[PDB]
Amino acid sequence: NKAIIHSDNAPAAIGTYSQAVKVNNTVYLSGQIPLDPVTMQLVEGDFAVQAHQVFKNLRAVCEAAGGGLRDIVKLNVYLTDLANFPIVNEVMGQYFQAPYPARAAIGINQLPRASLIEADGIMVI
Amino acid sequence: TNKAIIHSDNAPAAIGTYSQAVKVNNTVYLSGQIPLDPVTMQLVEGDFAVQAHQVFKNLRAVCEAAGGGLRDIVKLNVYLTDLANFPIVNEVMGQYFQAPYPARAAIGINQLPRASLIEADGIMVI
Amino acid sequence: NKAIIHSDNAPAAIGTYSQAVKVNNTVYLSGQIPLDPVTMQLVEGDFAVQAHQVFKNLRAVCEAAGGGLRDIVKLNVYLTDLANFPIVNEVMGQYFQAPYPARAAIGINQLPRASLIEADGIMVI
């Protein structure tokens, strides 16, 4: 049972990808960056503001997929500077409650739109 | 728990301690493919677009060996040494995938196997 | 529906993540780095020592999840330097037997605690 997920409260998938794909109860989430889905530009603000937007964006995809952030089982967090990770960890506390998803945090070189953070993952409802 | 090793003679041999892909029930977990020519086991020569084409042909072969095709990929991870190349990736992908497209993530990283410019892995279902 | 994995033989998951999440026989493993679970500092030694510790850590999580490394179907390996990758093949050979998992090997910029290697993955029992 395969389905493309789209939410108009998450940035439009421009190009050869979908916001997420759902097969039975498992949902594969595309990477989200701090795009404001309205302006299609990065939200303005410090790292924390960008992290907030990434999770708001994922939340909308999760909701469009029939669940919420609580259904995320694995989260990949890509940062241009790992020094920012404690902020990610703390912001996550506002969007997730125990039990938390598995997680991998990696310091990488570049992200789309010069973002400071991109996160993707897997959800199971 | 029934673990099937996927192997295609039309994808680069999996050298070392990994398999080209593993199938369990409905899901196929695809290893990262770089722009290796399966016959020579050296990178193809050509511009970035040629590199990306080889990556998709390589993934295609693995998908075919797993009983499907690129259309069955539900998630694709694309790693690039330089994000300036991403438009070309999106253009090249367009020649291999049609709507409905897979979920995707694109990350600018530091190094790839064999100093490749692009590597992609993913997950297939069917 | 979801079960949280806790192994006291792998580094404690501090903050907003779980060591692993298990749902219907699929286990999503967090990234492990070469932390000694006792000291919560990196093990001392060269790259091979670090790689051993990463796999010991993953194995502990897999065991707490009701399986072992043999049940891993996909492994992501992140290295600060791909020059180290032959050692990864070598070390993995000691921890895994054919049939080997699918794998992606990526050279990245930085890792938690200045680690030289982090690996995460997916296990199916």
PDB file of C-alpha atoms in Angstrom, chain C residues 31-120:
ATOM      1  CA  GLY C  31      24.648   6.406  15.808  1.00  0.00           C
ATOM      2  CA  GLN C  32      27.331   4.953  18.075  1.00  0.00           C
ATOM      3  CA  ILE C  33      30.719   6.597  18.561  1.00  0.00           C
ATOM      4  CA  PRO C  34      33.807   5.087  20.242  1.00  0.00           C
ATOM      5  CA  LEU C  35      32.701   6.084  23.781  1.00  0.00           C
ATOM      6  CA  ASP C  36      33.623   3.724  26.607  1.00  0.00           C
ATOM      7  CA  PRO C  37      30.235   3.223  28.272  1.00  0.00           C
ATOM      8  CA  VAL C  38      31.969   3.229  31.681  1.00  0.00           C
ATOM      9  CA  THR C  39      33.815   6.534  31.379  1.00  0.00           C
ATOM     10  CA  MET C  40      31.692   8.203  28.719  1.00  0.00           C
ATOM     11  CA  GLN C  41      34.969   9.312  27.185  1.00  0.00           C
ATOM     12  CA  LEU C  42      36.448   8.028  23.899  1.00  0.00           C
ATOM     13  CA  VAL C  43      38.493   4.850  24.169  1.00  0.00           C
ATOM     14  CA  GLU C  44      42.220   5.594  23.959  1.00  0.00           C
ATOM     15  CA  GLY C  45      44.077   4.259  20.921  1.00  0.00           C
ATOM     16  CA  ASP C  46      44.403   4.412  17.137  1.00  0.00           C
ATOM     17  CA  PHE C  47      41.637   4.249  14.569  1.00  0.00           C
ATOM     18  CA  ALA C  48      41.296   0.460  14.805  1.00  0.00           C
ATOM     19  CA  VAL C  49      40.675   0.709  18.572  1.00  0.00           C
ATOM     20  CA  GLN C  50      37.979   3.334  17.939  1.00  0.00           C
ATOM     21  CA  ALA C  51      36.349   1.168  15.247  1.00  0.00           C
ATOM     22  CA  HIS C  52      36.312  -1.847  17.550  1.00  0.00           C
ATOM     23  CA  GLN C  53      34.557   0.220  20.207  1.00  0.00           C
ATOM     24  CA  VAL C  54      31.910   1.436  17.769  1.00  0.00           C
ATOM     25  CA  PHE C  55      31.044  -2.162  16.877  1.00  0.00           C
ATOM     26  CA  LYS C  56      31.112  -3.366  20.493  1.00  0.00           C
ATOM     27  CA  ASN C  57      28.676  -0.548  21.315  1.00  0.00           C
ATOM     28  CA  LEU C  58      26.359  -1.419  18.430  1.00  0.00           C
ATOM     29  CA  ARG C  59      26.483  -5.092  19.329  1.00  0.00           C
ATOM     30  CA  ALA C  60      25.389  -4.276  22.893  1.00  0.00           C
ATOM     31  CA  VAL C  61      22.397  -2.341  21.600  1.00  0.00           C
ATOM     32  CA  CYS C  62      21.545  -5.150  19.153  1.00  0.00           C
ATOM     33  CA  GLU C  63      21.737  -7.718  21.977  1.00  0.00           C
ATOM     34  CA  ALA C  64      19.451  -5.638  24.207  1.00  0.00           C
ATOM     35  CA  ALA C  65      17.066  -5.544  21.232  1.00  0.00           C
ATOM     36  CA  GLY C  66      16.860  -9.334  21.180  1.00  0.00           C
ATOM     37  CA  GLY C  67      19.313  -9.999  18.369  1.00  0.00           C
ATOM     38  CA  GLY C  68      22.891  -9.330  17.344  1.00  0.00           C
ATOM     39  CA  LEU C  69      25.078  -7.654  14.721  1.00  0.00           C
ATOM     40  CA  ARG C  70      24.147 -10.513  12.375  1.00  0.00           C
ATOM     41  CA  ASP C  71      20.638  -9.050  12.257  1.00  0.00           C
ATOM     42  CA  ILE C  72      21.810  -5.676  10.931  1.00  0.00           C
ATOM     43  CA  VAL C  73      20.584  -5.215   7.338  1.00  0.00           C
ATOM     44  CA  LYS C  74      21.980  -1.755   6.677  1.00  0.00           C
ATOM     45  CA  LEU C  75      24.905   0.071   8.203  1.00  0.00           C
ATOM     46  CA  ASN C  76      25.865   3.709   7.699  1.00  0.00           C
ATOM     47  CA  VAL C  77      29.519   4.443   8.421  1.00  0.00           C
ATOM     48  CA  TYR C  78      30.696   8.039   8.851  1.00  0.00           C
ATOM     49  CA  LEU C  79      34.446   8.745   8.880  1.00  0.00           C
ATOM     50  CA  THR C  80      36.338  11.996   9.327  1.00  0.00           C
ATOM     51  CA  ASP C  81      38.927  10.497   6.964  1.00  0.00           C
ATOM     52  CA  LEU C  82      38.237   7.828   4.321  1.00  0.00           C
ATOM     53  CA  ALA C  83      41.932   6.968   4.360  1.00  0.00           C
ATOM     54  CA  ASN C  84      40.844   4.982   7.422  1.00  0.00           C
ATOM     55  CA  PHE C  85      38.265   2.941   5.560  1.00  0.00           C
ATOM     56  CA  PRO C  86      40.343  -0.185   4.865  1.00  0.00           C
ATOM     57  CA  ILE C  87      40.623  -0.603   8.642  1.00  0.00           C
ATOM     58  CA  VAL C  88      36.821  -0.479   8.792  1.00  0.00           C
ATOM     59  CA  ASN C  89      36.541  -3.422   6.360  1.00  0.00           C
ATOM     60  CA  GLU C  90      39.120  -5.275   8.367  1.00  0.00           C
ATOM     61  CA  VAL C  91      37.474  -4.632  11.730  1.00  0.00           C
ATOM     62  CA  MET C  92      33.963  -5.299  10.380  1.00  0.00           C
ATOM     63  CA  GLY C  93      35.194  -8.707   9.215  1.00  0.00           C
ATOM     64  CA  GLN C  94      35.717  -9.612  12.870  1.00  0.00           C
ATOM     65  CA  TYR C  95      32.182  -8.603  13.882  1.00  0.00           C
ATOM     66  CA  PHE C  96      30.133  -9.675  10.867  1.00  0.00           C
ATOM     67  CA  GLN C  97      30.040 -12.862   8.826  1.00  0.00           C
ATOM     68  CA  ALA C  98      28.674 -13.277   5.308  1.00  0.00           C
ATOM     69  CA  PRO C  99      25.977 -12.451   4.413  1.00  0.00           C
ATOM     70  CA  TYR C 100      27.101  -8.869   5.117  1.00  0.00           C
ATOM     71  CA  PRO C 101      24.727  -5.940   5.562  1.00  0.00           C
ATOM     72  CA  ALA C 102      24.148  -3.278   2.953  1.00  0.00           C
ATOM     73  CA  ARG C 103      26.427  -0.350   3.649  1.00  0.00           C
ATOM     74  CA  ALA C 104      26.995   3.301   2.865  1.00  0.00           C
ATOM     75  CA  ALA C 105      30.386   4.788   3.639  1.00  0.00           C
ATOM     76  CA  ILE C 106      30.652   8.543   3.828  1.00  0.00           C
ATOM     77  CA  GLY C 107      33.510  10.933   4.513  1.00  0.00           C
ATOM     78  CA  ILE C 108      32.177  13.736   6.693  1.00  0.00           C
ATOM     79  CA  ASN C 109      33.533  16.808   8.458  1.00  0.00           C
ATOM     80  CA  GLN C 110      33.076  16.204  12.173  1.00  0.00           C
ATOM     81  CA  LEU C 111      31.497  13.819  14.659  1.00  0.00           C
ATOM     82  CA  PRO C 112      30.354  14.003  18.281  1.00  0.00           C
ATOM     83  CA  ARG C 113      33.209  14.099  20.814  1.00  0.00           C
ATOM     84  CA  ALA C 114      35.676  14.521  17.934  1.00  0.00           C
ATOM     85  CA  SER C 115      35.282  10.828  17.097  1.00  0.00           C
ATOM     86  CA  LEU C 116      36.940   9.402  13.973  1.00  0.00           C
ATOM     87  CA  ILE C 117      34.032   7.075  13.236  1.00  0.00           C
ATOM     88  CA  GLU C 118      30.315   6.804  13.922  1.00  0.00           C
ATOM     89  CA  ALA C 119      28.020   4.069  12.654  1.00  0.00           C
ATOM     90  CA  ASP C 120      24.264   3.656  12.779  1.00  0.00           C
TER      91      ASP C 120
END
